[PDB]
Structure 1
């Protein structure tokens, strides 16, 4: 793969990167950069936490938005030179951004890609949209939930609807936190050295969503139907019960981590209600879920149930949970970038040299 396009999706927690045309990211590494805590000069990814002990670790991406441009540069460098092993100047590069990304950010990003990395061509696409594309639709409402943030994004004919976007500062990073908390409140000594890592694995291995939380609690109270076990490496085995479904419940009841916000079913319903009454039909029947925090077993049907209850009785609801939705966004991009009707949509270095960083903002 040379003279081919690159796809780079920068999550709050995870970076996904690869080549357009590929069915999956060749590179998935933690979105973190570490510099020597005292006085080589920088580390990124797995190696940065491997040596967390002698570095100050930082996260360029907070809430899905880029906040540290220097550190973000180191991430992109590590992406091209160290992960993909490619030269940016001979690959058009597609990049992804959060809904509601400020214009100054988009331009700052376009500006770096050109001046600093000297890529021949580039494009910025909104993450949620790519997810939708990945499913083969151009109309619907996406629920993207990654490590740092959660959005509801209504989309109509390839264009998102900014007035109707719902943002929720609750994602997997805080769900892992919640689980770590509870687990400990039951005598399980957990810290960050290496525990934080285990707590996350338990999360993705054992947690699931209850179709009926009140009802599911009573089950785990009257039998051991729902107990499951996890042997730590130390050796100490531990058992989990209602904790398996109480942790993800936080997505529907944020008041579990004490957030007086509303749950993803409500924000999904509110988001649709915020749209043209004539396209609601299309939206209700096209809930596409993306992100790693949507991977919980049972979340699709819980959502289906919750929404059927909020909406009109006559409307047909539908939830689409691609088994690959952990990587939907990236896949969405992988597809786009490879299509031929898209090849005219690239921003060329030439175009940028004439107009300026502002040559990356279109309406319609």
Structure 2
């Protein structure tokens, strides 16, 4: 059968840690349309033991006058299309995270922080986010970067001017990130508007249409079992759905987990047979025309960005295709990706596909190991005295982070 989810962890702490040399340990925080992930950096230790608040970033409140329902225990979330675009829920999300991390004594957030932002972040959203971060929370200095570049910075061979493609996936997007000598080539980076939410919503809608006996019993929190544990991505899609065509393959390979139980009962508590369906929700990022929506998908975007470039700079970067975030958790992902890439490389040419050491957590460990090294790069971090003149759109172009564009925003 299905399991069910679990909640109410013990992230209860004293007001904060203290470490040798400069005393203020930085906070490391990831945004996330699926889940937020956070912690104190734990500097001077490599085996960073306790990331905390690894929680589904969706909230409510008790409208009868009870409590703010920020943490784990209809619903709203502070992100749209992977960019934060909210205040009235973003506040109680950050307050909840800061309660469990601890604040040292009073009505200001004492320690410096590193925080994730979108592959490109709309100028106004950084303005609103920095305005919350400095008007309300009052942090002394702040750093920004991308989950994908942080998880790459974690998985690099060396702390050097490496180059590659980063392939990223998550709730409402996947992005292809051409990085040249540590610099994101933002003029020819691309994204597809599909990923985890679309795959889960699609797998739901398939089972809603295929099994009209159980229409309220199936829900996204049950789709996540079959999506993250029973599904796999094809090595070649027409080759997998071809071998599903014969019943002797089907009945042996099909997954068959019962609904939660109380005519041989399964007409009410069905095994919800999935065979091609446990491939279709994975394929969405490769063929978005499995949904209605026309976009190139990962294979044609990967080809499209490469033919922007001279043939030598292709060969020296395609040596590091890195897989990270979200849907890259599917079993068989590397074996699909390297086949789709072999089909479009020059005939004898070499390439290598690298999968993250932990495709969900490595963004935090990347930002952590980054902050542990860049701790006193006082030119890199956005300092509170810089936000005292810079309007909140501002960014500084440090390694493993987004590209600033010189610009100014009217606000009153």
Normalization by structure 2: what TM-score?
0.79
Q: Distance in 1 between matches of 2:49 and 2:181?
A: 24
Q: What is the deviation of 1:123?
A: 0.8
Q: Is the 8 A contact 1:220 1:227 kept in 2?
A: no
Q: Distance in 1 between matches of 2:93 and 2:181?
A: 33
1:298-317 equivalent positions in 2, closer than 5 A: 298-317=332-351
Q: What is the deviation of 1:169?
A: 1.0
Q: What is the deviation of 1:110?
A: 2.1
Q: What is the deviation of 1:98?
A: 0.6
Q: Is the 8 A contact 2:168 2:325 kept in 1?
A: yes
Q: Distance in 1 between matches of 2:27 and 2:77?
A: 23
Q: Is the 8 A contact 1:228 1:241 kept in 2?
A: yes
Q: Does residue 178 of structure 1 match 2:202?
A: yes
Q: 1:274-326: CA deviations, max 9, x gaps?
A: 34654322321211111121100111111100011123223322211124011
Compare the two structures and name the one with the higher strand fraction. Answer: 1
1:278-357 equivalent positions in 2, closer than 5 A: 278-340=312-374, 343-344=377-378, 345-357=380-392
> What is aligned with 2:56?
30
Q: How many residues align?
A: 355
Q: Is the 8 A contact 1:8 1:96 kept in 2?
A: yes
Q: Distance in 2 between matches of 1:343 and 1:65?
A: 27
Q: Is the 8 A contact 2:151 2:356 kept in 1?
A: no
Q: Distance in 2 between matches of 1:7 and 1:119?
A: 13
Q: Is the 8 A contact 2:257 2:272 kept in 1?
A: yes
Q: What is the deviation of 1:85?
A: 3.0
> What is aligned with 1:241?
275
Q: Distance in 1 between matches of 2:201 and 2:61?
A: 25
Secondary structure (helix, strand or coil) at the match of 1:70 reads: coil
Task: Please say which of residues 28-37 and 331-340 is displaced more in the overlay.
Answer: 28-37
> What is aligned with 1:212?
236
User: Of residues 168, 175, 179 in structure 2, which corresponds to 1:155?
Assistant: 179
CA RMSD of aligned residues (A): 2.5
Q: Is the 8 A contact 1:18 1:24 kept in 2?
A: yes
> What is aligned with 1:101?
121
Compare the two structures and name the one with the higher helix fraction. Answer: 1
> What is aligned with 2:222?
198
Q: Is the 8 A contact 2:148 2:325 kept in 1?
A: no
Q: 1:47-86: CA deviations, max 9, x gaps?
A: 4xxxx4xxxx2121111111113322221111111x3234
> What is aligned with 2:7?
none
User: Of residues 259, 263, 271 in structure 1, which corresponds to 2:293?
Assistant: 259
Q: What is the deviation of 1:151?
A: 0.9
Q: Does residue 85 of structure 1 match 2:93?
A: no
Normalization by structure 1: what TM-score?
0.88
Q: Distance in 1 between matches of 2:224 and 2:342?
A: 31
Secondary structure (helix, strand or coil) at the match of 2:284 reads: helix
Q: What is the deviation of 1:353?
A: 2.5
- Structure 1 6/275 Cα, relative in aligned 2: closer, same or farther at 3 Å? farther
Q: Which runs of 5+ in 2 are unaligned?
A: 1-16, 19-23, 43-47, 263-268, 398-402, 405-412
- Structure 1 277/101 Cα, relative in aligned 2: closer, same or farther at 3 Å? farther
Q: 1:130-186: CA deviations, max 9, x gaps?
A: 121121163211111112211111112222111111111101111011111222333
Q: Which runs of 5+ in 1 are unaligned?
A: none
Structure of larger gyration radius: 2
Task: Please say which of residues 330-339 and 238-247 is displaced more in the overlay.
Answer: 238-247
